[PDB]
Subunit: 208 residues, 4 copies
C-alpha cells in the first residue's frame, strides 16, 4: 500500500451527479420575470471557517461546544467575517441574479445576536444594489424565530443555494429548486457533505 | 514546456454534464409498463472498430471509401463482428430492460446487405430472449429505407441510447429520452464526440 | 454499488494516486546524449490492442474458460492473421517514432506461444513504419508458470529499457536492473482485471491507454 | 469556453499531467535509516492557510491594490495575531508529525516582512504540537541588509529538505542542491494565480491542498 498505483478505469470513473454551470442556470431562467432567491451563508457565499476556527481555539479547543457559547456568536456576527473570504462561485451567481432584478435573501442558521454586521459585509463584498439587498435572516427553532422552511415560503423564494444537506431538504420540503454548492476541502466544518446525494443539481467548480 | 505541471483547480475541474447510472435510469422507470426502447450499435453496445480497421486497410488504405465498398459491408455484417467486443454498460442496460419486459430494438447506420448475422451476434452476446429481441434495423437516406427518426417514431421507442450526436438529436426530434453512451478512447471512429453537448443524460463509466 | 445517489465532494474530486507520471517528451529528454541502444516492448496492450483476437479465440475454443490460451490451434490463428484486427496504440507510435529517430534497435518480446510461422513481425513493422535497420523479428518467450520468461531475452539483447502494461513486464525489467516503463492497459481490453500501474514505483506514461 | 453545453469525452476525463506525485508515507520511507537532520517549511499556503489575514489586510489598507504588502501597519497586525485566523493544513500536520517522530529539527522560513515582535512561532508550535527540542523560531528571510535570503538560510542551517507551494521555494532548494518538495496551494487562497506544481520536475505531495 506504499505504491498503490492506479488504472484508467479508475482515472475516468465519474460519480453519477447532475452537474450544472452558472450559465446553464441563467439559461434555464430565460424569460422568467424577477423573483425571490435565497443563499445559505457559510461555505455557500463565504468561506467563514477562519472565524469558526478562532472561536473553537478560544472556547472549545477539543470540541464543538463553542457553537453554543453566546460569547462566540457576539464576536462572529460582529466583525470576524472581516476575515471571511467571499467565494467566486457566489460572486457569479449573485451578479447573475442582480442582472435579472431578482430579490436576494441570505438565510443563516447562526445564533441570532442583538446586533450583526454580516449584512453589511455581504453587501460590500458582493456590491449588491440597495434594490436587491435584504437584511440577513436568522432562522431557527426558537419561539420568536421562524424555521428555514417557513422563511423560504414566507418570502416566496423559488431557488435556494447551499452546501449542506439541510439546505437541500429545506428546498425540497417547500417544493422549490434547491441547488448545491461545494464546500471547500479546507473548511473546518467536517466531514464534507456528499454533493448530489438527493439527486439535486450541483454547481461545478463552486468550492472557491 | 517539458514540465507543464498542474494545480488543484485543474484537478477538481468538472464539465457541466448530467451524469446518470444504470441504477438511476432503472429507478426512474419504476411503475411504467413495458415499452419499446432502442440502441445504436457501433460504440454503443459493440466495440466494432476491429472490423472497420481491417476494412480500411483491405479496401481503402488511404481514404474512407471502404465505407462505400459493398464488399466491405458483406464482410462487416456477416462475420467480422465475431471480433467485436461487447460493452459492459450495454450488458447492464439490456439486462435491465429485459427484466422490465421491454421490447428492444437496434438501429444501425451500417449499409444494408442481403444477409446479416449481426442480429444473431447481439442476441447471443447479451442473452436477449426471443420475446424481447427484434431483427436489426438498417436506416439511411436510401428511398427504399426509412431514416433513423422515422424508425424511432414508427416503433414508438420511448428511450434511445447512442454514442453519437445524431443519436441524441434524433431522439430530441422525436420528443423522447435520448441517453448518451461514451465512445471508447481507442475507437477508430474519430474525433470523439462531446457527450453532453445537448444537455442530455450521460451514463457513467460507459466507455467499456 | 448499492447507493442510488452516492454524490461526491471536492476532496474526492481532486484526490490523486501517488504515481510517477511521465510523458514521451520527458522520456526523450532523459535520453539526450545517449548513444543508440537496444530497447524492448511487450506487445499485447502495450503496442497493440489485440483483445479482438483473444476474444474470438475464447469464444471459438473455450467459451467457459481460459483453456484456449494453451490450445495450439488458437495460437496458429492469432500469430498468422488475427492481428489484422488488432488496433495499434498511438502512445506506442510516439515511442517507436522517438526511438527510431534516436537510431535505437527495437525488440518485441511477447508471452504468446511460439508457432511454426508468424506474421506479427510484419504487422508491427508495417503499422508503425519501422525501418529494417531498427526492426528485429518478434521474440516469442512463451509463458511458463512460476517463472518469468522475458528476463532471459532482456539480458541477452542488452535492452536498457522495457515498455509494458503488465506487472511481469515491470518486474522483468527490475530483475535486470534496467528502466521499466509502464503503459496503461485500455479499459475495454478483455484481459482483466486491469493492473495497478505504478505499483512498483515505476514511471507510468500519461494517456497511454489508446 | 463560453459554450453552454461543452460536454466532455473519456480521453479528456482520463487525461493526466506528467507530474511526479508522492505521498507522505513514501517520503517517510525514503528517509528510513537516516539520522536526525534539519528540514524547512515555507509558511503561507504550505503549513497555514493564511489568506484570511491578507484579505482583511488588503480590505483595510489597499482596497484597490496590493500596496498593503508594503505597509508596516499591516505586517504589525499580520505577524502579531491575525494568524489566529489562519487555518493549519492537514498535509502539514502529517509531515511535521513524521519529522518529529524522526527527531529532526524543524525550521519555518517566510518571505513576510520582519517586525520587532511576532507571535507566529508560538502559533505554529501550539497548532502542530512541536516539542521544544524540535522547534525553532520563525526565520524572516529577505533583501534588507539586516537579514539573509531564503537560499542563505537553507545553507546556513544545513536543511536537507524544504517544503513549499511557490516556484521560488522549489528553485531555492535546487540552488542549494537539496530536495525540494511541492505543496499544493488551495483553490480558495487569495494569492493568485495558482502556480504550476511540478513545473520543475519536483515531487508533489498528493492531496496537500488542505
Ligand atoms: N466545526 C465547524 N467549523 C466551521 N463552521 C461550522 C462548524 N460547525 C458548524 N459550522 C457552521 O456554522 C453554521 C451554523 O448555522 P448553519 O446551520 O446555517 O450552518 C453552520 C455551518 O456553516
Ligand atoms: N473510421 C471508422 N472506424 C470505426 N467505425 C467507423 C468508422 N467510420 C465509420 N464508422 C462506424 O460505421 C457506422 C455506420 O453507421 P452509423 O452512422 O450508425 O455509425 C458509423 C460508425 O459507428
Ligand atoms: N483473457 C485475455 N484477454 C486478452 N488477452 C489476454 C487474455 N489472457 C491473456 N492475454 C494476453 O495473452 C498474452 C500472452 O503473452 P503475454 O504474457 O506477453 O501477455 C498476455 C496477454 O496480453
Ligand atoms: N494576495 C495575497 N493573498 C494571500 N497571500 C498573499 C498575497 N500576496 C502575497 N501573499 C503572501 O505573502 C507572503 C510574503 O512572503 P512569501 O514570499 O514567503 O509568500 C507570500 C504569500 O504567501
Ligand atoms: Mg452552509
Ligand atoms: Mg454508434
Ligand atoms: Mg501486455
Ligand atoms: Mg507559501
Amino acid at each position: 500500500t506504499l505504491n498503490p498505483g492506479t488504472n484508467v478505469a479508475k482515472l475516468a470513473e465519474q460519480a453519477p451527479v447532475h452537474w450544472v454551470s452558472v450559465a446553464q442556470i441563467e439559461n434555464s431562467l430565460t424569460g422568467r420575470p424577477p423573483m425571490a432567491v435565497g443563499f445559505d451563508i457559510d461555505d455557500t457565499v463565504l468561506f467563514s471557517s477562519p472565524g469558526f476556527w478562532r472561536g473553537k481555539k478560544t472556547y472549545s479547543p477539543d470540541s464543538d461546544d463553542y457553537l453554543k457559547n453566546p460569547a462566540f456568536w457576539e464576536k462572529m456576527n460582529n466583525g470576524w467575517d472581516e476575515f471571511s473570504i467571499p467565494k467566486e462561485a457566489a460572486r457569479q451567481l449573485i451578479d447573475m441574479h442582480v442582472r435579472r432584478g431578482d430579490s436576494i435573501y441570505f438565510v443563516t442558521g447562526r445564533s441570532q445576536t442583538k446586533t450583526e454586521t454580516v449584512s453589511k459585509t455581504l453587501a460590500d463584498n458582493f456590491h449588491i444594489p440597495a434594490a436587491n439587498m435584504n437584511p440577513v435572516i436568522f432562522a431557527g427553532d426558537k419561539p420568536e424565530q421562524n424555521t428555514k422552511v417557513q422563511w423560504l415560503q414566507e418570502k416566496n423564494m423559488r431557488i435556494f443555494y447551499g452546501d449542506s444537506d439541510n439546505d437541500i431538504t429545506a428546498a425540497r420540503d417547500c417544493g422549490i429548486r434547491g441547488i448545491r454548492i461545494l464546500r471547500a476541502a479546507n473548511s473546518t466544518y467536517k466531514p464534507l457533505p456528499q454533493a448530489g446525494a438527493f439527486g439535486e443539481e450541483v454547481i461545478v467548480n463552486s468550492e472557491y
